[PDB]
Amino acid sequence: PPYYAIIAGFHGLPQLSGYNTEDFSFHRFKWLKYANNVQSYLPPFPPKVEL
Amino acid sequence: MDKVKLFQTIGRVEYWERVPRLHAYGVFALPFPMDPDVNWAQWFTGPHPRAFLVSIHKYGPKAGHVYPTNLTDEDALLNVIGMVLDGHDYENDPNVTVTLKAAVPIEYVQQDPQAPALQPHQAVLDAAEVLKLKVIKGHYFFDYTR
Amino acid sequence: MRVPININNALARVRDPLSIGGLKFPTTKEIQEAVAAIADKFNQENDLVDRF
Amino acid sequence: TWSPLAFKESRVWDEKEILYLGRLADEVQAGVINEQIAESLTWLMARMRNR
């Protein structure tokens, strides 16, 4: 019974480049919670078309 | 409301993919007569993809005719021979292509026609040893030839 | 994936040639038609995390 | 020490999907599965970019 197949993929992982050398900490990006409620300062969005 | 009627949905057609099997494991299929007593048009209703375990009559007047396996009768449980992956039209063919050795997910094995699709049927898992389906992952494994 | 229909024939084939029961005879009418496929542009991909 | 990962998935097209798959509102000879394989190929490429 004739069939047909396709396989696909890769190898990898994201590497952090910089590290501190005196202590071994990392500081390049950080997050923050600045606004408690700010959805009121935003226009509404149209809904999804479930056809 | 009276002289002008607005838009209104008439039709709705949805279309799915097929039931995926493993490439690495293999396929083996042998075509069988369909048992005319069971209502086959119920088993091929919905557009969702499914697959269902099939047991063969060992003997009797309909020896060779295959029917969907009932999970209540042990003489229908022991003689299971395979599972129809794709789907079929009994209004044009009494001879379905039963697959004997394949590897189908748990999501796409529905032994009842009114059981909800895309959801694992539980009575197949609670009869996994009698039906000789080994579960190792999501994907089932069965070789009824050996 | 798409539902593999032919676009310029589905609208021509949806209607029925029975069409008797309104006035008990076939009325006249004029029909124009249109097709527009829809998909939300708000499910955007992330274009920042490959600049990092 | 760093170490990468591995990623694969696959497709199968059966014999009665390849052999006959027609248009729904048209009657053409069976050659439609080529576009279906093209869409699944592009979808697996997008799936790797999603990872």
CSV table of C-alpha atoms in Angstrom, one decimal, chain A residues 18-43:
chain,number,residue,atom,x,y,z
A,18,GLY,CA,27.3,37.4,28.6
A,19,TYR,CA,28.0,36.5,32.2
A,20,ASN,CA,29.5,38.6,35.0
A,21,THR,CA,33.0,37.5,35.8
A,22,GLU,CA,33.5,38.7,39.4
A,23,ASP,CA,30.3,37.0,40.7
A,24,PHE,CA,28.5,34.8,38.3
A,25,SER,CA,25.3,36.8,38.0
A,26,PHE,CA,23.5,37.9,34.9
A,27,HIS,CA,21.9,41.3,34.3
A,28,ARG,CA,20.9,42.3,30.9
A,29,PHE,CA,17.1,42.2,30.8
A,30,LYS,CA,14.5,42.5,33.7
A,31,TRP,CA,10.8,42.7,34.0
A,32,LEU,CA,8.6,45.1,35.9
A,33,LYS,CA,4.9,45.6,36.8
A,34,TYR,CA,4.3,49.3,36.4
A,35,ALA,CA,0.5,49.7,35.9
A,36,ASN,CA,-2.2,48.0,37.9
A,37,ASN,CA,-5.1,48.7,35.6
A,38,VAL,CA,-4.4,50.1,32.1
A,39,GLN,CA,-6.9,48.3,30.0
A,40,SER,CA,-9.2,51.2,30.6
A,41,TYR,CA,-6.8,53.4,28.6
A,42,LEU,CA,-7.0,51.0,25.6
A,43,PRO,CA,-9.6,50.7,22.8
